[PDB]
Design an enzyme around this catalytic site. Structure first.
Site: not given
Length: 164
Positions: A11, A20
């Site tokens: 991540e 994202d």
């Protein structure tokens, strides 16, 4: 290597609100803030999450606290899920980490939808399950990360991350 180091590789760490891979407002270590298009809705969720006026920005510590909460919630979520729990209980320690990673990225509901793959993991048919997992939007959309997770389920080792 452990679940935290694993997820930290996958991540990243960002201290300012960001979008994202799916275009959603996120912060820290993959902490989803909202699927809403408003940066304003994002900043509000953020302040609600931290308990301060952050103005879209957080510290390392804050990011790590959110991360601890998220990993904890992912595990507890698997344990309470009737479809997930039996799979998790049947797995060895490393593969357990691979399932946690999927739940963190895609939510309980999403992973629970991988019926056939779940069945193969439970049965310990590593090769079969790896091939089945790859036939998903998940794999097509974030292929490098999916490959790392998939190899983890396939081998039961941390090879895919020993690189990284």
């Amino acid at each position: 290597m452990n679940i935290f180091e694993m997820l930290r590789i996958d991540e990243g760490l960002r201290l300012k609100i960001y979008k994202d891979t799916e275009g959603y407002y996120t912060i820290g270590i993959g902490h989803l803030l909202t699927k809403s298009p408003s940066l304003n809705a994002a900043k509000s969720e953020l302040d609600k999450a931290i308990g301060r006026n952050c103005n879209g920005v957080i510290t390392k510590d804050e990011a790590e606290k959110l991360f601890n909460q998220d990993v904890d919630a992912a595990v507890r979520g698997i344990l309470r899920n009737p479809k997930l729990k039996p799979v998790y209980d049947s797995l060895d320690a490393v593969r357990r980490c691979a399932l946690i990673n999927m739940v963190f990225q895609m939510g309980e509901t999403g992973v629970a939808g991988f019926t056939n793959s779940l069945r193969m993991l439970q049965q310990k048919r590593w090769d079969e399950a790896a091939v089945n997992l790859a036939k998903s939007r998940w794999y097509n959309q974030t292929p490098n990360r999916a490959k790392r997770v998939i190899t983890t389920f396939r081998t039961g080792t941390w090879d895919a991350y020993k690189n990284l």
